[PDB]
Design an enzyme around this catalytic site. Structure first.
Site, mmCIF file in Angstrom:
data_model
loop_
_atom_site.group_PDB
_atom_site.id
_atom_site.type_symbol
_atom_site.label_atom_id
_atom_site.label_comp_id
_atom_site.label_asym_id
_atom_site.label_seq_id
_atom_site.Cartn_x
_atom_site.Cartn_y
_atom_site.Cartn_z
ATOM 1 N N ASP A 181 0.857 -1.214 0.000
ATOM 2 C CA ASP A 181 0.000 0.000 0.000
ATOM 3 C C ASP A 181 0.891 1.262 0.000
ATOM 4 O O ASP A 181 0.509 2.203 -0.672
ATOM 5 C CB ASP A 181 -0.971 0.012 1.196
ATOM 6 C CG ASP A 181 -2.280 -0.748 0.992
ATOM 7 O OD1 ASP A 181 -2.425 -1.438 -0.045
ATOM 8 O OD2 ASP A 181 -3.186 -0.615 1.863
ATOM 9 N N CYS A 215 -2.247 0.075 -13.573
ATOM 10 C CA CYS A 215 -2.284 0.121 -12.099
ATOM 11 C C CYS A 215 -3.504 0.980 -11.749
ATOM 12 O O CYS A 215 -4.539 0.784 -12.421
ATOM 13 C CB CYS A 215 -0.935 0.589 -11.545
ATOM 14 S SG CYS A 215 -0.218 2.043 -12.383
ATOM 15 N N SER A 216 -3.427 1.959 -10.845
ATOM 16 C CA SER A 216 -4.576 2.883 -10.696
ATOM 17 C C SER A 216 -4.535 4.014 -11.748
ATOM 18 O O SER A 216 -5.535 4.188 -12.453
ATOM 19 C CB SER A 216 -4.723 3.453 -9.280
ATOM 20 O OG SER A 216 -6.056 4.011 -9.153
ATOM 21 N N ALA A 217 -3.443 4.781 -11.838
ATOM 22 C CA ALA A 217 -3.326 5.883 -12.828
ATOM 23 C C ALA A 217 -2.699 5.396 -14.147
ATOM 24 O O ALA A 217 -2.841 6.088 -15.166
ATOM 25 C CB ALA A 217 -2.520 7.030 -12.228
ATOM 26 N N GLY A 218 -2.027 4.246 -14.162
ATOM 27 C CA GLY A 218 -1.352 3.767 -15.388
ATOM 28 C C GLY A 218 -0.031 4.507 -15.683
ATOM 29 O O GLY A 218 0.370 4.558 -16.866
ATOM 30 N N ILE A 219 0.692 4.969 -14.668
ATOM 31 C CA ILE A 219 2.000 5.657 -14.894
ATOM 32 C C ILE A 219 3.082 5.179 -13.938
ATOM 33 O O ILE A 219 4.273 5.258 -14.325
ATOM 34 C CB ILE A 219 1.841 7.201 -14.888
ATOM 35 C CG1 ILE A 219 1.289 7.785 -13.586
ATOM 36 C CG2 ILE A 219 1.002 7.642 -16.057
ATOM 37 C CD1 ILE A 219 1.357 9.332 -13.495
ATOM 38 N N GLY A 220 2.751 4.820 -12.694
ATOM 39 C CA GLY A 220 3.760 4.520 -11.654
ATOM 40 C C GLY A 220 4.292 3.097 -11.698
ATOM 41 O O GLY A 220 5.369 2.865 -12.324
ATOM 42 N N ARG A 221 3.593 2.154 -11.053
ATOM 43 C CA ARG A 221 3.921 0.696 -11.141
ATOM 44 C C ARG A 221 3.961 0.252 -12.620
ATOM 45 O O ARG A 221 4.863 -0.527 -12.989
ATOM 46 C CB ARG A 221 2.920 -0.140 -10.344
ATOM 47 C CG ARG A 221 2.857 0.231 -8.868
ATOM 48 C CD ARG A 221 1.740 -0.492 -8.141
ATOM 49 N NE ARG A 221 1.424 0.148 -6.876
ATOM 50 C CZ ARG A 221 0.414 -0.214 -6.071
ATOM 51 N NH1 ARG A 221 -0.379 -1.223 -6.411
ATOM 52 N NH2 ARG A 221 0.230 0.424 -4.914
ATOM 53 N N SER A 222 3.015 0.687 -13.430
ATOM 54 C CA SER A 222 2.944 0.402 -14.886
ATOM 55 C C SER A 222 4.241 0.847 -15.577
ATOM 56 O O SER A 222 4.793 0.087 -16.462
ATOM 57 C CB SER A 222 1.736 1.103 -15.505
ATOM 58 O OG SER A 222 0.499 0.544 -15.059
ATOM 59 N N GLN A 262 6.569 7.579 -10.712
ATOM 60 C CA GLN A 262 5.861 8.694 -9.991
ATOM 61 C C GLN A 262 6.678 9.255 -8.809
ATOM 62 O O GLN A 262 6.307 10.368 -8.334
ATOM 63 C CB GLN A 262 4.518 8.224 -9.405
ATOM 64 C CG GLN A 262 3.406 8.180 -10.422
ATOM 65 C CD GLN A 262 2.088 7.746 -9.808
ATOM 66 O OE1 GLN A 262 1.884 6.578 -9.461
ATOM 67 N NE2 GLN A 262 1.185 8.696 -9.655
#
Ligand SMILES: O=C1N[C@@H](c2c(F)cccc2Cl)Nc2ccccc21
Length: 284
Positions: A181, A215-222, A262
């Site tokens: 988290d 992921c949620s926004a599609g920029i960080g983990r992605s 991010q």
């Protein structure tokens, strides 16, 4: 400069925040006019995360062709990825329309449906074999065929049916379920294991459409997933694997979608994953 030495130099100096801000300063800026049209406000999860007009995925319909999704095309590595947000209650049908139209074989999911006590994306796939989902707005049916639940990830076979033509295809959903988290994983071992499972499946290969990653926004983990994959592939292909500059690969990818990676901790984790993964790519 060997990235492993660059790594220890940044770590001993503790300059991660300073490197990360240099990337943010040099990153491309292109227009996102379609994303900001008023008809599209309920198609965007976050007001500050939009696809560029030049690289956005278009839905094949005359009504409204808009989805929050970008095509990342890596010319020297010969890999393509679609990076997208976690689907919303009103975009689940658009999501599966895109998977169908682009001929994707895999979906890669790097988040849980609930994290930090809030919803990060819609429950967009069926949880029981005998309770299939129908998307009436895009005329698609989705059935759970099987699940394989492991300690760090789950794999499943979805049957997607185009109700218009009665064609079907098998889609593989790769769900990484253990990203914490807050912060990033302590070791990249389980993330690299997961990336090699997606590869071994054929989902990243040129005989299919591009893999859909979110992921949620599609920029960080992605962002982390596609940066690590592309950097390890370039180290396989080139005569001098030490020429691979992770900061330059990240700036190339940021020509196609804003904000990839991010935080300064996600940048450090990306270096760690590439450094540890290379100890397979170079013959072990
Ligand atoms: O790891 C994989 N498991 C299977 C799988 C499932 F997805 C669901 C239920 C049972 C099984 Cl056996 N599907 C795959 C396809 C291509 C590459 C890897 C895998």
């Amino acid at each position: 400069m060997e990235m492993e030495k660059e790594f220890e130099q940044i770590d001993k100096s503790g300059s991660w925040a300073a490197i990360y801000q240099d990337i943010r300063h040099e990153a491309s800026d292109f227009p996102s006019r379609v994303a900001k049209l008023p008809k599209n406000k309920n198609r965007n999860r976050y007001r500050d995360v939009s696809p560029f007009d030049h690289s956005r995925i278009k839905l094949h319909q005359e009504d409204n062709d808009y989805i929050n999704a970008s095509l990342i095309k890596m010319e020297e590595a010969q890999r393509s990825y679609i990076l997208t947000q976690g689907p919303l209650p009103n975009t689940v049908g658009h999501f599966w329309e895109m998977v169908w139209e682009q001929k994707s074989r895999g979906v890669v999911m790097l988040n849980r449906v609930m994290e930090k006590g809030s919803l990060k994306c819609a429950q967009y796939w069926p949880q029981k074999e005998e309770k299939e989902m129908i998307f009436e707005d895009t005329n698609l049916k989705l059935t759970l065929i099987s699940e394989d639940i492991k300690s760090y990830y789950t794999v499943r076979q979805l049957e997607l049916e185009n109700l218009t033509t009665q064609e079907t295809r098998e889609i593989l959903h790769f769900h990484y379920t253990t990203w914490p988290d807050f912060g990033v994983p302590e070791s990249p071992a389980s993330f690299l294991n997961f990336l090699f499972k997606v590869r071994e499946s054929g989902s990243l290969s040129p005989e299919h459409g591009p893999v859909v990653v979110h992921c949620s926004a599609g920029i960080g983990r992605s962002g982390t997933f596609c940066l690590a994959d592309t950097c390890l592939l370039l180290m396989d292909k080139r005569k001098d694997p030490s020429s691979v500059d992770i900061k330059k690969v990240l700036l190339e990818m940021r020509k196609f979608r804003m904000g990839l990676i991010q935080t300064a901790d996600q940048l450090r984790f990306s270096y760690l994953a590439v450094i540890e993964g290379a100890k397979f790519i170079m013959g072990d």
